[PDB]
Write a protein that binds this ligand. Structure first.
Ligand SMILES: [Mg+2]
Ligand SMILES: [Mg+2]
Ligand SMILES: [Mg+2]
Ligand SMILES: [Mg+2]
Ligand SMILES: [Mg+2]
Ligand SMILES: [Mg+2]
Ligand SMILES: [Mg+2]
Ligand SMILES: [Mg+2]
Ligand SMILES: [Mg+2]
Ligand SMILES: [Mg+2]
Ligand SMILES: [Mg+2]
Ligand SMILES: [Mg+2]
Ligand SMILES: [Mg+2]
Ligand SMILES: [Mg+2]
Ligand SMILES: [Mg+2]
Ligand SMILES: [Mg+2]
Ligand SMILES: [Mg+2]
Ligand SMILES: [Mg+2]
Ligand SMILES: [Mg+2]
Ligand SMILES: [Mg+2]
Ligand SMILES: [Mg+2]
Ligand SMILES: [Mg+2]
Ligand SMILES: [Mg+2]
Ligand SMILES: [Mg+2]
Ligand SMILES: [Mg+2]
Ligand SMILES: [Mg+2]
Ligand SMILES: [Mg+2]
Ligand SMILES: [Mg+2]
Ligand SMILES: [Mg+2]
Ligand SMILES: [Mg+2]
Ligand SMILES: [Mg+2]
Ligand SMILES: [Mg+2]
Ligand SMILES: [Mg+2]
Lengths: 262, 206, 152
RNA sequence: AGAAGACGGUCGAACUUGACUAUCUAGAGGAAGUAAAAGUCGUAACAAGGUUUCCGUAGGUGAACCUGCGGAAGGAUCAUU
RNA sequence: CCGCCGGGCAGCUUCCGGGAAACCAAAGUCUUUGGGUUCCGGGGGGAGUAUGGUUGCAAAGCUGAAACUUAAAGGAAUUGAC
RNA sequence: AUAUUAAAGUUGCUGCAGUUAAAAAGCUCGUAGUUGGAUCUUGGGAGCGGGCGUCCCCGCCGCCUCUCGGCGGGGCCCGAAGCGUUUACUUUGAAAAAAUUAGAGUGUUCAAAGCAGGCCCGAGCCGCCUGGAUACCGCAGCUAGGAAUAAUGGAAUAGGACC
RNA sequence: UACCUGGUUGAUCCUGCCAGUAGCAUAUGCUUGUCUCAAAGAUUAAGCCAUGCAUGUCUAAGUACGCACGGCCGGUACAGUGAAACUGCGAAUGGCUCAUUAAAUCAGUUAUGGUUCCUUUGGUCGCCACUUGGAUAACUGUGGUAAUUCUAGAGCUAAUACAUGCCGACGGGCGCUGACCCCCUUCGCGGGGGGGAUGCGUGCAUUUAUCAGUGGUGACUCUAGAUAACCUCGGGCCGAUCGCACGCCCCCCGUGGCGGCGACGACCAUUCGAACGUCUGCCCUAUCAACUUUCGAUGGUAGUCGCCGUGCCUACCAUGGUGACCACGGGUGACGGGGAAUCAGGGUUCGAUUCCGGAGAGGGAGCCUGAGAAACGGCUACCACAUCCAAGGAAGGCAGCAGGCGCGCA
RNA sequence: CCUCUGGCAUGUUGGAACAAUGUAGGUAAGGGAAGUCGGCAAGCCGGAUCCGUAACUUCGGGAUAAGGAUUGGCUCUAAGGGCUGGGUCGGUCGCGGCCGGCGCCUAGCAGCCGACUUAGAACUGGUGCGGACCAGGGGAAUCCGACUGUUUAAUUAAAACA
């Protein structure tokens, strides 16, 4: 590589895009954006695979440029704009409005929400700052330098953001006994209260998560993004509920749904 | 061209490293500033990511600071006197970081005399008669004299420095890296250091 | 003298050694104000660093250099470089055809700060990784046990 | 503002010359190995093979070989009062 | 003279058990395979040759190939023939 | 025809040989290497659970700390700390590109493949139900439990604790 | 499926090999109806290349006076399409090949508290201004050369190109300075308390120094703040900027206020990354045993350069550093890995080749542009090959896709 | 090679010319041993410093092998040595002594002297610099004699004698 890389091979593409083999060489490749390529859903895929609205990239292009689509409600004309975790996608003319939230398998579920609720989002803080002249800042995971926060929102905590105004509107401090969804690794999509956080100096920090239905499991803090004040969540969750079933329990639940219900 | 990189020298063991690539514009050097003393001359360089490196080439003014006193006027860089790396830089008179230059005393002098209200650099009665009396002459009384009396056994500057001024340059060390910054800012040798570099210079003179 | 054995004066950066004008002799009792820090991860920044007057930029306590990354134990084999030693880290590499092992040593070079006086060879040493500070060196010495048999 | 030009430096192709190194090949004559063969000279070895063979080592011999010294049994004596 | 004890040199003895066997109380405790560890062989020839190194006064020693060739060469035991 | 794998326990860790078939250095010393005897908390005690008593199974006897923090005097026991004397080992957790591979689901007409399909429905529903799993991923690095084995420390011209 | 058979002998049992047997690639022979997939100039020659193609690009929104088209409207420049040209962006990806390269590449792991980052997203962005200077292209016209994606002179004429540079702003606010003035006490010097014109500074970024200890971390010489100065001076910077669509409201008539995009910039975060570092791991090879070092070997101190940490480089010191746990060298029919073929369990072999990383563009060197190149479908050199020449000169790079020659079993 | 002390009058004559032949010195375009019995003769080489040195070998050598580089002038830097000195505070006796107590440079510092080298740098010239002088040409082979030594005073130095 002489300079930056611009293409993305289909296959080099991430798995959670459900992009198939025989269709092209390439995958889209997101744009530089508010999410890490590896952890996005390029609006193209979102539209003409998951929402099947378009058929090709062209049909995606045409939808995008009646200026319908509205990622965290601000109108985007890129197909490769990476719409990622806890953005919105107000599609407006149809009036569905989504969120993208990790399904238990971990693939950015299609998750419709009510316009009231699609007002607000939820953001993990990556840092506190103090810039010049003693103004303090935040930084959301997804880039939003807020400025002048509550001197209270510390690291790894979350913020419910208004969208229209921006500006932090009410916030939840990462502690034990606090709802969360994991945004990485194997336990991506799963949900529970916390229970335990282990500090290890330097070497980064584990956090166990006790699911509602017993299953304790763990992860590194990095991936834990909170969504509640213990049990009660500050958003809609997609059905599946961030539970995660054993392959056999899953097989049963399919087998019960088949034959009987109809 | 003139490159900086590990690949081209031997290892810990002393084997010969083979090169797998060729030179890379970033594994890269440029020929040196070795800025001399003289009238201002700076050429800016483009570096990685754009940006600038202002290679000094001649220089005269420098923003030196009398540390103790907390004044820092910008002053003539009068000569290079000593340099720890290599005696040749001193002989060529080349300004680089951690040099020991000389800088005009004058702006520090002036400020001592306007702040502390005493003189600096001893003399019979040419400086004392006209200017310092005019600097003094307390038409106010009460407040200003009380302030300058509060500047008590406190003005009490060092012996080496008082000597330097009465000569009238300062030993000064350069803190900037002229070849990259453009400037040649520094600090005035004081106390234990000054005493050390004076002892170094005397020895060199023999 | 004593400290300044070099061509340039050896001052610790950070601290200014010059503001003074009061009674009770010239300078204080301790005279200088020594800069040091603590280096973290649970390590006792020792007495001989803080008490002592020496000066080293490559001291992890009393000089600029962040410990950050891997932490490795070795054992000191030589001490013949100035302010630096070599430690031999030994380990049983696994070959899996023969479900066996092979011994293997890597005498890495290491920066020994002279907070540590009276360190000998055969002395277990725990180095902290840091920024490359010689061509070979990337590890400062942080704690030395020496208690392998031979005396207190 | 500023071109061409030039001192020096710097990287440094490239050439000229040695020096090492790896490989590949020519060669009068020499001296092997193998294989073909319906040759020549013997008869070393296997039966005590007609001088037990065999070892190590020396000298000699047209050739196999012989002899000297000290070994071996894998001998042609597990045994001789 | 008659025992016993340790440790040697061997000997005879047998369905210990092995082994292609002749044989071996070890050559046993091995497809029921692992006490420890060193040296070593990988069809027969070429060949312990050529070459390089090394040692030696020499004689020679230690290290040590290949090209080429070739279906056996070999061990043990049996019946014969001699 | 040639390379190459199995056959080949004819390269042998599993697993081969070395009296006579090919093979143990002429002998002994010897450093590196490899290998190294035995030895320290154990029965018991008390309960939940199973076939007045016996025989099998399951939480307990990480110690100390209060010199530290608090979920004008205190309790209560958690954050810190003498971190597990210091490893190996094991077990758990995390972290682990996809494709491949294994392997769920799914009549591509079968299959190799592929990742989808399937449904209600007279279509008036102007639709709906779903998949796109899981495993493995040496060695090294990281996390917690276990402490048999194997190494390794600690008091011997003396040293551990005490308003 | 955890398999064996033929061959030394007159027969026998062994040791042993040869030979068969079954997979997989490459080639080839002979054959071949149908359908679905699908490898394919790697092995030899990273040998050579005829010809064509493979990187260009315009919206409402950067410059249109071609007149090349055309309006509907004039005369208040501009109306609407628009070749060309200047400007901006891109050409650093993709594609190809596997020559080199053996702790190198590369894989896992870790650092960046040691640096850069076009863009993307989010922050910040208090007397020419009713808007300045001159220049140049296309265009028009003179031309020169045998000849090139050669250009020279003469006319003009644009800007978001290139330059230049103002109103705001509160004789006010806060730091110093302080003409002086006032009140209390005192025998009085003095002591305490107040006020205060006139001056300098009147900071985001940069450079240096000093002082203190809002927010952070296992971890600061961090972030933020105070003081002093400096400006990396026009070639520090934002300071203070150009385009498009609709078109409104004034205790008020001719002025002054206004939403909605576009483009732009300095600093910060953001992403894409990049870049160097940490720990462990690679085939044969001793007919390779010592190797490295004043021409950096391995340390140290000060610098230099570099985006930054480091012998990266220079200077002065010290004498280090690796090695039988195989260094050093040599070889490789060696790009690394994911993987592939074989397989009971163990293994063996292969991996030029569709993903990831790396390298290179006939060979070597240097460099401009630019955020990113030491780019080769960019230059400048030499060498090697080659092409026209009017002999003075000029142009070249298939290991892109096709294609050819050459090499070969391919 | 040039000079001072000291010594001399150019070695048994002078003058004028400057032809050939000579004797002794030089130089030579291009070629470079073709010359000749034969490279005879002359020519190259040469000093020092820094590298770098083969076959072969009696392991001593071969060796200055071979083969390369540098050298002037000037202006600097760095490195190499000697000597002497504190018994200071208190007491007392005559700047000097004697006693007692500190100090005790015990990492030494201070002043004062003195040869001479060597290494590095900058500038500098019409690339010239061991500027004269002095001063090895190399290599591959064979024959002989080991070697060093000796030998025919007046033709033989050799492989002869030792
Ligand atoms: Mg590419
Ligand atoms: Mg195994
Ligand atoms: Mg016949
Ligand atoms: Mg045996
Ligand atoms: Mg066995
Ligand atoms: Mg053989
Ligand atoms: Mg095989
Ligand atoms: Mg097998
Ligand atoms: Mg065998
Ligand atoms: Mg035999
Ligand atoms: Mg034998
Ligand atoms: Mg033996
Ligand atoms: Mg034991
Ligand atoms: Mg037969
Ligand atoms: Mg076979
Ligand atoms: Mg980044
Ligand atoms: Mg090769
Ligand atoms: Mg390249
Ligand atoms: Mg080519
Ligand atoms: Mg290039
Ligand atoms: Mg090309
Ligand atoms: Mg004469
Ligand atoms: Mg005469
Ligand atoms: Mg005479
Ligand atoms: Mg001539
Ligand atoms: Mg001739
Ligand atoms: Mg002739
Ligand atoms: Mg001659
Ligand atoms: Mg010679
Ligand atoms: Mg002869
Ligand atoms: Mg002689
Ligand atoms: Mg004679
Ligand atoms: Mg003679």
């Amino acid at each position: 590589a002489r300079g930056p890389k611009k293409h993305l091979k289909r296959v080099a593409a991430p798995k959670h895009w459900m992009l198939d083999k025989l269709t092209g060489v390439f995958a889209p490749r997101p744009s530089t954006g508010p999410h890490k390529l590896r952890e996005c859903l390029p609006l193209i895929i979102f539209l003409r695979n998951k929402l099947k609205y378009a058929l090709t990239g062209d049909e995606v292009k045409k939808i995008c440029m009646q200026r319908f689509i509205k990622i965290d409600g601000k109108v985007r004309a890129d197909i490769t704009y990476p719409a990622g975790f806890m953005d919105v996608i107000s599609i407006d003319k149809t009036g569905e409005n989504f969120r993208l939230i990790y399904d238990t398998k971990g693939r950015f579920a299609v998750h419709r929400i009510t316009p009231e609720e699609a007002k607000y989002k939820l953001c993990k803080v990556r840092k506190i700052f103090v810039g010049t002249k003693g103004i303090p800042h935040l930084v959301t995971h997804d880039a939003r330098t807020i400025r002048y926060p509550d001197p209270l929102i510390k690291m790894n905590d979350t913020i419910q953001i208004d969208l229209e105004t921006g500006k932090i509107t009410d916030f939840i401090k990462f502690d034990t006994g606090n709802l969360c969804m994991v945004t990485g690794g194997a336990n991506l999509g799963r949900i529970g209260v916390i229970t335990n956080r282990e500090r290890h100096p330097g070497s980064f920090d584990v956090v166990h998560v006790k699911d509602a239905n017993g299953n304790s499991f763990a992860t590194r803090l990095s991936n834990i993004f909170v969504i509640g004040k213990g049990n009660k969540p500050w958003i809609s969750l997609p059905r599946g509920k961030g539970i995660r079933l054993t392959i056999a329990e899953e097989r049963d639940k399919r087998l019960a749904a088949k034959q009987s219900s109809g | 061209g003139i490159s900086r990189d590990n690949w081209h020298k031997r290892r810990k063991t002393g084997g010969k490293r083979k090169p797998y690539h060729k030179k890379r514009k970033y594994e890269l050097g440029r020929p040196a500033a070795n800025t001399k003393i003289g009238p201002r001359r700076i050429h800016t360089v483009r570096v990685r990511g754009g940006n600038k490196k202002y290679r000094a080439l001649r220089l005269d003014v420098g923003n030196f600071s009398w540390g103790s006193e907390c004044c820092t006027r910008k002053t003539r860089i009068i000569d290079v006197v000593y340099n720890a790396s290599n005696n040749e830089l001193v002989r060529t008179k080349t300004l680089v970081k951690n040099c020991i230059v000389l800088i005009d005393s004058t702006p520090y002098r002036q400020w001592y005399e306007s702040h502390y209200a005493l003189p600096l650099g001893r003399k019979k009665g040419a400086k004392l008669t006209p200017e310092e009396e005019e600097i003094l002459n307390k038409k106010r009384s009460k407040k200003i004299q009380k302030k300058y009396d509060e500047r008590k056994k406190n003005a009490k500057i060092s012996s080496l420095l008082e000597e330097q001024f009465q000569q009238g340059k300062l030993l000064a060390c350069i803190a900037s890296r002229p070849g990259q910054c453009g400037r040649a800012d520094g600090y005035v040798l004081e106390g234990k250091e000054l005493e050390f570099y004076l002892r170094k210079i005397k020895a060199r003179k023999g | 003298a004593d400290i300044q054995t070099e061509r340039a004066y050896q001052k610790q950066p950070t601290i200014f050694q010059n503001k003074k004008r009061v009674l009770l002799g010239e300078t204080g009792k301790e005279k200088l104000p020594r800069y040091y820090k603590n280096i973290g991860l649970g390590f006792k920044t020792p007495k001989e660093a803080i008490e002592g007057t020496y000066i080293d930029k490559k001291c992890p306590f009393t000089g600029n250099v962040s410990i950050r990354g891997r932490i490795l134990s070795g054992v000191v084999t030589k001490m013949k470089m100035q302010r630096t030693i070599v430690i031999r880290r030994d380990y049983l590499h696994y070959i899996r055809k023969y479900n066996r092992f092979e011994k293997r040593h890597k005498n890495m070079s290491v920066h020994l700060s002279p907070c540590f006086r009276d360190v000998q060879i055969g002395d277990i040493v725990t180095v902290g990784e840091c920024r490359p500070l010689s061509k070979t060196v990337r590890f400062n010495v942080l704690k030395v046990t020496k208690a392998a048999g031979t005396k207190k």
